[PDB]
Amino acid sequence: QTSCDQWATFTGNGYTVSNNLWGASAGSGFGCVTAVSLSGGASWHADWQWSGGQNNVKSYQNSQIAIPQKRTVNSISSMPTTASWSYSGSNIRANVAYDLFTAANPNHVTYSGDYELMIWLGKYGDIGPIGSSQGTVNVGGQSWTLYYGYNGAMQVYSFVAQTNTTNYSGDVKNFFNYLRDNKGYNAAGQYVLSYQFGTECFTGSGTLNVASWTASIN
Template identity: 50%
Template sequence: MLSSLATIAAFVAVAHGAATGLPSRTTAADAALCSQYAYQSVNGYDLLNNLWGISTATSGSQCTTYDGPAGSGIAFSSTWTWQGDQNTVKSYIYAGRQFQRKKVSDIRSLPTTVEWSYNRTDHRANVAYDIFTSTDPDHANSSGDFELMIWLHRYGGIWPITSSSTGSPIATVTVAGYSWDLYTGYNGAMRVYSFVAPNGPYNSFTADVKEFFNYLVKNESFPESQQYMLIYQFGTEAFVGGPIKFGVSKFQAEVN
Protein backbone atom coordinates (compact mmCIF):
# COMPACT_ATOMS: atom_id res chain seq x y z
CA MET A 1 0.00 0.00 0.00
CA LEU A 2 1.16 3.54 -0.61
CA SER A 3 0.24 7.18 -0.74
CA SER A 4 1.38 10.26 -2.57
CA LEU A 5 4.03 12.33 -0.81
CA ALA A 6 1.47 15.03 -0.08
CA THR A 7 -0.78 12.67 1.88
CA ILE A 8 1.71 10.30 3.53
CA ALA A 9 0.93 11.32 7.10
CA ALA A 10 -2.84 11.11 6.76
CA PHE A 11 -3.32 8.26 4.34
CA VAL A 12 -4.47 4.97 5.85
CA ALA A 13 -5.56 2.76 2.98
CA VAL A 14 -8.16 0.02 2.84
CA ALA A 15 -6.49 -3.40 2.60
CA HIS A 16 -5.65 -4.88 -0.81
CA GLY A 17 -7.77 -8.02 -0.44
CA ALA A 18 -11.45 -8.40 -1.00
CA ALA A 19 -12.54 -7.58 2.53
CA THR A 20 -16.27 -7.64 1.97
CA GLY A 21 -18.11 -10.63 0.55
CA LEU A 22 -16.80 -13.37 -1.69
CA PRO A 23 -15.08 -12.56 -4.98
CA SER A 24 -16.81 -13.67 -8.14
CA ARG A 25 -15.05 -16.59 -9.85
CA THR A 26 -14.32 -16.99 -13.53
CA THR A 27 -13.21 -20.29 -15.04
CA ALA A 28 -12.84 -19.65 -18.77
CA ALA A 29 -9.17 -19.07 -19.65
CA ASP A 30 -9.90 -16.06 -21.86
CA ALA A 31 -12.76 -14.50 -19.88
CA ALA A 32 -12.29 -10.88 -18.81
CA LEU A 33 -12.50 -10.10 -15.09
CA CYS A 34 -14.27 -6.75 -14.90
CA SER A 35 -16.30 -6.60 -11.69
CA GLN A 36 -14.94 -5.28 -8.39
CA TYR A 37 -13.46 -8.50 -7.03
CA ALA A 38 -13.67 -10.76 -10.09
CA TYR A 39 -11.36 -13.73 -9.47
CA GLN A 40 -9.81 -16.62 -11.32
CA SER A 41 -7.73 -19.54 -10.03
CA VAL A 42 -5.41 -20.97 -12.68
CA ASN A 43 -2.25 -23.11 -12.73
CA GLY A 44 -1.49 -22.56 -9.04
CA TYR A 45 -2.06 -18.81 -9.12
CA ASP A 46 -4.84 -16.43 -8.07
CA LEU A 47 -5.77 -13.62 -10.44
CA LEU A 48 -7.84 -10.76 -9.03
CA ASN A 49 -9.34 -7.63 -10.55
CA ASN A 50 -9.16 -5.93 -7.17
CA LEU A 51 -11.00 -2.57 -7.33
CA TRP A 52 -10.67 -1.97 -3.60
CA GLY A 53 -10.41 1.84 -3.92
CA ILE A 54 -13.10 2.39 -6.53
CA SER A 55 -15.10 4.62 -4.17
CA THR A 56 -12.55 7.42 -4.67
CA ALA A 57 -12.94 7.38 -8.47
CA THR A 58 -15.24 9.85 -10.21
CA SER A 59 -15.28 7.61 -13.28
CA GLY A 60 -13.42 4.73 -14.82
CA SER A 61 -13.25 0.98 -15.28
CA GLN A 62 -10.85 -1.93 -15.35
CA CYS A 63 -10.80 -5.41 -16.90
CA THR A 64 -8.16 -8.07 -16.28
CA THR A 65 -7.53 -11.15 -18.41
CA TYR A 66 -5.63 -14.40 -17.98
CA ASP A 67 -3.52 -14.69 -21.14
CA GLY A 68 -2.29 -18.26 -20.74
CA PRO A 69 0.58 -20.23 -19.23
CA ALA A 70 4.15 -18.88 -19.32
CA GLY A 71 6.62 -21.58 -18.40
CA SER A 72 5.59 -22.75 -14.95
CA GLY A 73 3.94 -19.36 -14.36
CA ILE A 74 1.19 -17.36 -16.01
CA ALA A 75 0.68 -14.38 -18.30
CA PHE A 76 -2.00 -11.78 -17.66
CA SER A 77 -2.96 -8.26 -18.64
CA SER A 78 -5.30 -5.47 -17.61
CA THR A 79 -6.77 -2.42 -19.30
CA TRP A 80 -7.84 0.42 -17.04
CA THR A 81 -8.85 4.07 -16.94
CA TRP A 82 -9.50 6.03 -13.75
CA GLN A 83 -10.36 9.63 -12.92
CA GLY A 84 -10.76 11.18 -9.48
CA ASP A 85 -8.50 11.91 -6.54
CA GLN A 86 -4.97 11.60 -7.94
CA ASN A 87 -3.58 10.69 -4.51
CA THR A 88 -5.64 7.57 -3.85
CA VAL A 89 -5.28 4.05 -5.20
CA LYS A 90 -8.28 2.84 -7.20
CA SER A 91 -7.20 -0.76 -7.71
CA TYR A 92 -4.50 -3.37 -7.31
CA ILE A 93 -4.40 -5.70 -10.30
CA TYR A 94 -2.46 -8.78 -9.25
CA ALA A 95 -1.58 -12.43 -9.59
CA GLY A 96 -0.65 -14.30 -6.41
CA ARG A 97 1.10 -17.62 -5.94
CA GLN A 98 -0.94 -20.26 -4.13
CA PHE A 99 1.04 -21.94 -1.33
CA GLN A 100 0.85 -23.51 2.12
CA ARG A 101 1.51 -20.84 4.71
CA LYS A 102 4.65 -21.21 6.79
CA LYS A 103 6.88 -19.09 8.99
CA VAL A 104 9.31 -16.87 7.13
CA SER A 105 12.18 -18.53 9.04
CA ASP A 106 11.12 -21.91 7.59
CA ILE A 107 11.14 -20.65 3.99
CA ARG A 108 14.40 -21.55 2.22
CA SER A 109 13.84 -19.50 -0.92
CA LEU A 110 11.24 -17.45 -2.83
CA PRO A 111 12.47 -17.54 -6.45
CA THR A 112 10.57 -15.40 -8.93
CA THR A 113 10.74 -14.11 -12.48
CA VAL A 114 8.53 -11.43 -13.98
CA GLU A 115 8.42 -9.61 -17.31
CA TRP A 116 6.01 -6.70 -17.60
CA SER A 117 5.24 -3.50 -19.52
CA TYR A 118 2.91 -0.51 -19.70
CA ASN A 119 1.96 0.86 -23.13
CA ARG A 120 1.99 4.47 -21.82
CA THR A 121 3.81 6.41 -19.14
CA ASP A 122 1.46 9.37 -18.53
CA HIS A 123 -0.35 7.92 -15.53
CA ARG A 124 0.01 7.49 -11.76
CA ALA A 125 0.72 3.93 -10.65
CA ASN A 126 3.35 1.59 -9.31
CA VAL A 127 4.40 -1.91 -10.35
CA ALA A 128 5.24 -4.01 -7.31
CA TYR A 129 5.45 -7.27 -5.44
CA ASP A 130 3.41 -7.26 -2.26
CA ILE A 131 3.72 -9.66 0.68
CA PHE A 132 1.94 -9.67 4.04
CA THR A 133 3.09 -11.52 7.16
CA SER A 134 1.42 -12.13 10.53
CA THR A 135 1.88 -14.04 13.78
CA ASP A 136 -1.50 -15.65 13.03
CA PRO A 137 -1.31 -18.30 10.27
CA ASP A 138 -5.07 -17.92 9.74
CA HIS A 139 -5.00 -14.13 9.36
CA ALA A 140 -6.95 -12.69 6.42
CA ASN A 141 -4.71 -12.11 3.41
CA SER A 142 -5.80 -8.47 3.14
CA SER A 143 -3.40 -7.15 5.82
CA GLY A 144 -0.91 -8.31 8.44
CA ASP A 145 1.66 -7.25 11.02
CA PHE A 146 4.20 -6.47 8.30
CA GLU A 147 4.08 -5.66 4.60
CA LEU A 148 7.02 -6.10 2.24
CA MET A 149 6.75 -4.30 -1.09
CA ILE A 150 9.26 -4.44 -3.94
CA TRP A 151 8.59 -1.61 -6.39
CA LEU A 152 9.97 -2.29 -9.86
CA HIS A 153 8.84 1.16 -10.99
CA ARG A 154 6.62 4.10 -10.10
CA TYR A 155 4.87 6.55 -12.42
CA GLY A 156 3.58 10.08 -11.95
CA GLY A 157 5.43 11.10 -8.79
CA ILE A 158 3.85 8.65 -6.33
CA TRP A 159 5.73 7.56 -3.22
CA PRO A 160 5.60 4.64 -0.80
CA ILE A 161 4.46 4.95 2.78
CA THR A 162 7.19 6.54 4.88
CA SER A 163 7.52 8.04 8.33
CA SER A 164 10.01 10.58 7.01
CA SER A 165 8.70 14.14 6.88
CA THR A 166 10.89 14.75 3.82
CA GLY A 167 9.97 11.56 2.00
CA SER A 168 13.58 10.39 2.07
CA PRO A 169 14.57 6.70 2.10
CA ILE A 170 16.14 5.28 5.25
CA ALA A 171 18.85 3.57 3.18
CA THR A 172 20.09 2.90 -0.32
CA VAL A 173 20.92 -0.79 -0.59
CA THR A 174 21.74 -3.62 -2.96
CA VAL A 175 19.59 -6.72 -2.53
CA ALA A 176 19.37 -9.71 -4.89
CA GLY A 177 21.77 -7.94 -7.25
CA TYR A 178 19.58 -4.84 -7.74
CA SER A 179 19.78 -1.32 -6.30
CA TRP A 180 16.95 -0.02 -4.09
CA ASP A 181 15.87 2.95 -2.03
CA LEU A 182 14.37 1.56 1.18
CA TYR A 183 11.40 3.31 2.80
CA THR A 184 9.47 2.38 5.92
CA GLY A 185 6.39 3.61 7.72
CA TYR A 186 3.05 2.46 9.07
CA ASN A 187 -0.29 1.71 7.47
CA GLY A 188 -2.36 1.80 10.66
CA ALA A 189 -0.61 -0.69 12.96
CA MET A 190 1.07 -2.56 10.09
CA ARG A 191 4.78 -1.86 9.51
CA VAL A 192 5.51 -1.39 5.81
CA TYR A 193 8.90 -1.85 4.15
CA SER A 194 9.17 -0.70 0.52
CA PHE A 195 12.20 -1.41 -1.66
CA VAL A 196 11.89 1.04 -4.58
CA ALA A 197 13.86 0.91 -7.85
CA PRO A 198 15.66 4.28 -7.91
CA ASN A 199 16.55 4.69 -11.58
CA GLY A 200 13.92 3.61 -14.05
CA PRO A 201 11.94 0.41 -14.42
CA TYR A 202 13.08 -3.16 -13.85
CA ASN A 203 10.88 -4.54 -16.65
CA SER A 204 12.57 -7.92 -16.48
CA PHE A 205 13.24 -9.06 -12.93
CA THR A 206 14.59 -12.34 -11.57
CA ALA A 207 15.44 -12.72 -7.88
CA ASP A 208 15.05 -14.69 -4.68
CA VAL A 209 12.64 -12.60 -2.61
CA LYS A 210 13.86 -14.37 0.55
CA GLU A 211 16.94 -12.14 0.24
CA PHE A 212 14.75 -9.12 1.03
CA PHE A 213 13.55 -10.79 4.20
CA ASN A 214 17.15 -11.70 5.04
CA TYR A 215 18.07 -8.02 4.74
CA LEU A 216 15.22 -7.01 7.05
CA VAL A 217 16.18 -9.67 9.61
CA LYS A 218 19.78 -8.45 9.69
CA ASN A 219 19.20 -4.70 9.49
CA GLU A 220 15.66 -4.05 10.76
CA SER A 221 15.22 -6.84 13.37
CA PHE A 222 12.38 -8.41 11.39
CA PRO A 223 11.01 -11.27 13.60
CA GLU A 224 11.05 -14.03 10.97
CA SER A 225 10.55 -16.87 13.48
CA GLN A 226 7.26 -15.29 14.62
CA GLN A 227 5.79 -14.28 11.24
CA TYR A 228 3.84 -16.44 8.78
CA MET A 229 3.88 -15.40 5.15
CA LEU A 230 0.26 -14.87 4.10
CA ILE A 231 0.34 -13.87 0.44
CA TYR A 232 2.93 -13.60 -2.37
CA GLN A 233 1.63 -11.41 -5.18
CA PHE A 234 2.70 -9.16 -8.05
CA GLY A 235 0.81 -6.45 -9.88
CA THR A 236 0.16 -2.74 -10.26
CA GLU A 237 -1.58 -0.20 -8.04
CA ALA A 238 -3.51 2.22 -10.27
CA PHE A 239 -4.24 5.82 -9.20
CA VAL A 240 -5.38 7.82 -12.25
CA GLY A 241 -4.81 7.84 -16.02
CA GLY A 242 -5.66 5.84 -19.07
CA PRO A 243 -7.01 4.23 -21.03
CA ILE A 244 -3.84 2.21 -20.58
CA LYS A 245 -2.74 -1.42 -20.75
CA PHE A 246 -0.62 -3.26 -18.20
CA GLY A 247 0.83 -6.49 -19.56
CA VAL A 248 2.67 -9.28 -17.78
CA SER A 249 4.11 -11.72 -20.29
CA LYS A 250 5.44 -13.94 -17.49
CA PHE A 251 5.00 -14.13 -13.73
CA GLN A 252 6.48 -17.11 -11.97
CA ALA A 253 6.95 -17.50 -8.21
CA GLU A 254 7.68 -20.38 -5.85
CA VAL A 255 7.73 -20.91 -2.09
CA ASN A 256 10.39 -23.40 -1.02
Protein backbone atom coordinates in the same frame (compact mmCIF):
# COMPACT_ATOMS: atom_id res chain seq x y z
CA GLN B 1 -10.51 -14.76 -20.03
CA THR B 2 -11.47 -11.05 -19.80
CA SER B 3 -13.66 -9.16 -17.34
CA CYS B 4 -14.05 -5.52 -16.29
CA ASP B 5 -16.04 -6.52 -13.17
CA GLN B 6 -14.67 -4.93 -9.98
CA TRP B 7 -13.92 -8.27 -8.34
CA ALA B 8 -13.22 -10.52 -11.31
CA THR B 9 -10.96 -13.49 -10.70
CA PHE B 10 -9.48 -16.26 -12.83
CA THR B 11 -7.84 -19.25 -11.10
CA GLY B 12 -5.80 -22.26 -12.06
CA ASN B 13 -2.78 -24.33 -11.13
CA GLY B 14 -2.10 -22.44 -7.93
CA TYR B 15 -2.17 -19.10 -9.70
CA THR B 16 -4.87 -16.48 -9.53
CA VAL B 17 -5.39 -13.36 -11.61
CA SER B 18 -7.64 -10.70 -10.01
CA ASN B 19 -9.08 -7.37 -11.22
CA ASN B 20 -9.33 -6.22 -7.59
CA LEU B 21 -10.64 -2.73 -8.35
CA TRP B 22 -11.02 -2.24 -4.63
CA GLY B 23 -10.90 1.56 -4.73
CA ALA B 24 -13.04 2.09 -7.81
CA SER B 25 -15.53 4.02 -5.71
CA ALA B 26 -12.82 6.64 -5.04
CA GLY B 27 -12.69 7.56 -8.74
CA SER B 28 -14.12 7.54 -12.28
CA GLY B 29 -13.21 5.15 -15.07
CA PHE B 30 -12.68 1.40 -15.35
CA GLY B 31 -10.38 -1.56 -15.13
CA CYS B 32 -10.31 -4.69 -17.30
CA VAL B 33 -8.10 -7.67 -16.75
CA THR B 34 -7.26 -10.51 -19.13
CA ALA B 35 -5.82 -13.81 -17.93
CA VAL B 36 -4.00 -15.12 -21.01
CA SER B 37 -2.46 -18.16 -19.40
CA LEU B 38 -2.25 -19.70 -16.01
CA SER B 39 -0.02 -22.58 -17.13
CA GLY B 40 3.53 -22.64 -15.87
CA GLY B 41 3.06 -19.24 -14.29
CA ALA B 42 0.67 -16.37 -14.89
CA SER B 43 0.39 -14.40 -18.16
CA TRP B 44 -2.01 -11.44 -18.04
CA HIS B 45 -2.68 -7.81 -18.86
CA ALA B 46 -4.64 -5.00 -17.23
CA ASP B 47 -6.25 -2.13 -19.12
CA TRP B 48 -7.55 0.80 -17.17
CA GLN B 49 -8.46 4.46 -16.97
CA TRP B 50 -8.94 6.41 -13.76
CA SER B 51 -9.52 10.03 -12.90
CA GLY B 52 -10.28 11.73 -9.62
CA GLY B 53 -9.12 10.88 -6.10
CA GLN B 54 -5.57 11.96 -6.87
CA ASN B 55 -3.96 10.22 -3.94
CA ASN B 56 -6.21 7.21 -3.52
CA VAL B 57 -5.51 3.82 -5.07
CA LYS B 58 -8.36 2.68 -7.35
CA SER B 59 -7.14 -0.83 -7.97
CA TYR B 60 -4.47 -3.44 -7.43
CA GLN B 61 -4.89 -5.72 -10.40
CA ASN B 62 -2.66 -8.67 -9.65
CA SER B 63 -1.50 -12.25 -9.93
CA GLN B 64 -0.78 -14.31 -6.85
CA ILE B 65 -0.11 -17.83 -5.71
CA ALA B 66 -1.95 -19.96 -3.27
CA ILE B 67 -0.32 -20.65 0.07
CA PRO B 68 -2.15 -23.66 1.51
CA GLN B 69 0.15 -24.00 4.54
CA LYS B 70 1.70 -20.89 6.13
CA ARG B 71 5.40 -21.15 7.10
CA THR B 72 7.86 -18.81 8.85
CA VAL B 73 10.16 -16.70 6.78
CA ASN B 74 13.30 -18.37 8.25
CA SER B 75 11.89 -21.86 7.61
CA ILE B 76 11.47 -21.06 3.91
CA SER B 77 14.61 -21.79 1.91
CA SER B 78 13.71 -19.73 -1.18
CA MET B 79 10.93 -17.56 -2.63
CA PRO B 80 12.02 -17.36 -6.23
CA THR B 81 10.17 -15.17 -8.71
CA THR B 82 10.42 -13.84 -12.24
CA ALA B 83 8.43 -11.05 -13.85
CA SER B 84 8.43 -9.86 -17.44
CA TRP B 85 6.22 -6.80 -18.00
CA SER B 86 5.75 -3.56 -19.91
CA TYR B 87 3.58 -0.49 -19.27
CA SER B 88 2.04 1.80 -21.90
CA GLY B 89 -0.48 4.57 -21.87
CA SER B 90 -0.65 8.17 -20.77
CA ASN B 91 -0.39 10.24 -17.65
CA ILE B 92 0.33 7.10 -15.71
CA ARG B 93 0.28 7.38 -11.91
CA ALA B 94 0.71 3.77 -10.87
CA ASN B 95 3.27 1.23 -9.72
CA VAL B 96 4.32 -2.33 -10.53
CA ALA B 97 4.75 -4.08 -7.24
CA TYR B 98 5.03 -7.29 -5.29
CA ASP B 99 2.97 -7.26 -2.10
CA LEU B 100 3.28 -9.70 0.84
CA PHE B 101 1.81 -9.72 4.33
CA THR B 102 3.42 -11.54 7.28
CA ALA B 103 2.17 -12.02 10.78
CA ALA B 104 3.26 -13.81 13.92
CA ASN B 105 0.04 -15.93 13.93
CA PRO B 106 -0.05 -18.35 10.95
CA ASN B 107 -3.85 -18.14 11.13
CA HIS B 108 -3.92 -14.36 10.93
CA VAL B 109 -6.35 -12.73 8.50
CA THR B 110 -4.79 -12.69 5.06
CA TYR B 111 -6.00 -9.18 4.16
CA SER B 112 -3.72 -7.44 6.69
CA GLY B 113 -0.68 -8.43 8.77
CA ASP B 114 1.89 -7.35 11.29
CA TYR B 115 4.17 -6.43 8.34
CA GLU B 116 3.69 -5.62 4.70
CA LEU B 117 6.61 -6.13 2.33
CA MET B 118 6.49 -4.46 -1.08
CA ILE B 119 8.95 -4.64 -3.96
CA TRP B 120 8.28 -1.89 -6.53
CA LEU B 121 9.75 -2.95 -9.84
CA GLY B 122 7.94 -0.02 -11.44
CA LYS B 123 6.93 3.46 -10.47
CA TYR B 124 5.06 5.90 -12.66
CA GLY B 125 4.27 9.44 -11.74
CA ASP B 126 4.62 11.14 -8.39
CA ILE B 127 3.12 8.42 -6.28
CA GLY B 128 4.98 7.47 -3.19
CA PRO B 129 5.20 4.45 -0.98
CA ILE B 130 4.18 4.39 2.66
CA GLY B 131 6.48 6.10 5.15
CA SER B 132 9.79 7.80 4.35
CA SER B 133 13.04 6.86 2.68
CA GLN B 134 15.64 4.94 4.61
CA GLY B 135 18.22 5.39 1.87
CA THR B 136 19.70 3.05 -0.73
CA VAL B 137 20.24 -0.70 -0.05
CA ASN B 138 21.61 -3.56 -2.19
CA VAL B 139 19.35 -6.62 -2.48
CA GLY B 140 19.95 -9.45 -4.88
CA GLY B 141 22.60 -7.52 -6.74
CA GLN B 142 20.29 -4.56 -7.46
CA SER B 143 19.96 -1.21 -5.76
CA TRP B 144 16.68 -0.22 -4.07
CA THR B 145 15.35 2.82 -2.23
CA LEU B 146 13.98 1.36 0.98
CA TYR B 147 10.96 3.01 2.57
CA TYR B 148 9.57 2.31 6.03
CA GLY B 149 6.52 3.50 7.90
CA TYR B 150 3.35 2.56 9.62
CA ASN B 151 -0.02 2.13 7.95
CA GLY B 152 -2.01 1.74 11.16
CA ALA B 153 -0.66 -0.94 13.44
CA MET B 154 1.12 -2.50 10.44
CA GLN B 155 4.78 -1.73 9.50
CA VAL B 156 5.42 -1.41 5.78
CA TYR B 157 8.74 -1.93 4.11
CA SER B 158 8.80 -1.02 0.42
CA PHE B 159 11.89 -1.62 -1.69
CA VAL B 160 11.62 0.67 -4.75
CA ALA B 161 13.65 0.07 -7.90
CA GLN B 162 15.73 2.98 -9.01
CA THR B 163 14.87 2.29 -12.62
CA ASN B 164 11.77 0.54 -13.97
CA THR B 165 12.70 -3.14 -13.83
CA THR B 166 10.71 -4.77 -16.59
CA ASN B 167 12.52 -8.14 -16.67
CA TYR B 168 13.18 -9.29 -13.17
CA SER B 169 14.47 -12.42 -11.56
CA GLY B 170 14.68 -12.52 -7.82
CA ASP B 171 14.23 -14.17 -4.47
CA VAL B 172 11.92 -12.43 -2.02
CA LYS B 173 13.78 -14.21 0.79
CA ASN B 174 16.68 -11.80 0.13
CA PHE B 175 14.39 -8.89 1.09
CA PHE B 176 13.13 -10.57 4.28
CA ASN B 177 16.82 -11.34 5.06
CA TYR B 178 17.86 -7.76 4.66
CA LEU B 179 15.12 -6.81 7.07
CA ARG B 180 16.14 -9.63 9.38
CA ASP B 181 19.79 -8.65 9.38
CA ASN B 182 19.54 -4.88 9.43
CA LYS B 183 16.12 -3.88 10.80
CA GLY B 184 15.41 -6.31 13.64
CA TYR B 185 12.67 -8.04 11.65
CA ASN B 186 11.60 -11.31 13.29
CA ALA B 187 12.02 -13.67 10.37
CA ALA B 188 12.11 -16.47 12.94
CA GLY B 189 8.56 -15.75 14.02
CA GLN B 190 6.87 -14.22 10.97
CA TYR B 191 4.63 -16.26 8.63
CA VAL B 192 4.18 -15.45 4.92
CA LEU B 193 0.47 -14.86 4.43
CA SER B 194 0.27 -13.64 0.81
CA TYR B 195 2.42 -13.43 -2.35
CA GLN B 196 1.09 -11.08 -5.00
CA PHE B 197 2.33 -9.08 -7.96
CA GLY B 198 0.43 -6.36 -9.72
CA THR B 199 -0.16 -2.69 -10.29
CA GLU B 200 -1.51 -0.09 -7.84
CA CYS B 201 -3.34 2.42 -10.07
CA PHE B 202 -4.09 5.98 -9.08
CA THR B 203 -4.90 8.02 -12.19
CA GLY B 204 -4.33 8.07 -15.93
CA SER B 205 -4.79 5.64 -18.81
CA GLY B 206 -2.77 2.53 -18.76
CA THR B 207 -2.09 -0.93 -20.07
CA LEU B 208 0.13 -3.31 -18.05
CA ASN B 209 1.27 -6.31 -20.05
CA VAL B 210 2.65 -9.07 -17.85
CA ALA B 211 4.16 -11.48 -20.35
CA SER B 212 4.97 -13.88 -17.55
CA TRP B 213 5.04 -13.91 -13.78
CA THR B 214 6.21 -16.87 -11.68
CA ALA B 215 6.50 -17.37 -7.96
CA SER B 216 6.94 -20.11 -5.40
CA ILE B 217 7.68 -20.72 -1.78
CA ASN B 218 10.12 -23.65 -1.17
